[PDB]
Design a protein around this ligand. Structure first.
Ligand SMILES: Nc1ccc2c(O)c(/N=N/c3ccc4c(O)cc(S(=O)(=O)O)cc4c3)c(S(=O)(=O)O)cc2c1
Length: 168
């Protein structure tokens, strides 16, 4: 329970907020997708295609284990699915970057939707969104409204840390 872990959907801007936060609080910033992708020598798309989702999820689960040994606190941005690992419990204080369905759908591109059929019909897209939101909300210490831009998300994270310094 040492780090500030940002969770949420693709496109909620976790990374960007993570970096800002690193600067703000004088802390190192890590990114789970970047770690795994720089290791394997492939992008994340390329991993799922070349290696399979199961294999990525194993890298991911393993990587959580590693990060729980870091000594100093860091700000960690995480991939969308990371919240599926029981393992993630104990890594740190999770903040959900809450973004709305409409804007998250608009933020996806063609390559993203090309390979995931659930994103292409309304009904399933919403159903997916609802069940995974509930999973981010379950697993979150703080919910952050990301709809107001990065600065406003940053102001909320800092509010909470101002109030409970045991966090950082
Ligand atoms: N509570 C949960 C549980 C599972 C999630 C989850 O599995 C996610 N992403 N999943 C996939 C699965 C297959 C993919 C696939 O086969 C290709 C690509 S890609 O070409 O765009 O890189 C991305 C893929 C993302 C995302 S979330 O959408 O990442 O938020 C969020 C999730 C949130």
């Amino acid at each position: 329970m040492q780090h500030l872990v940002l969770i949420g959907f693709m496109g909620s801007g976790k990374s960007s907020l993570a970096q800002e936060l690193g600067l703000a609080l004088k802390l190192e910033v890590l990114d789970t997708d970047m770690i795994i992708s720089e290791r394997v020598g492939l992008s994340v798309r390329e991993i799922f295609e070349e290696l399979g989702e199961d294999n990525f999820r194993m890298f991911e689960k393993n990587l959580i284990d590693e990060l729980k040994t870091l000594k100093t606190p860091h700000v960690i941005s995480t991939g969308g699915g990371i919240v599926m690992h029981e393992n993630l419990k104990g890594l740190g204080t999770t903040f959900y970057l809450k973004m709305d369905f409409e804007t998250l759908i608009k933020r996806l591109n063609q390559k993203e939707r090309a390979k995931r059929p659930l994103l292409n019909n309304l009904t399933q897209a919403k159903e997916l969104f609802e069940k995974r939101q509930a999973l981010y909300e379950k697993n979150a210490s703080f919910i952050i409204d990301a709809r107001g831009g990065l600065n406003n998300s940053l102001k909320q994270v800092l509010q909470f840390i101002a109030l409970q310094p045991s966090l950082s």
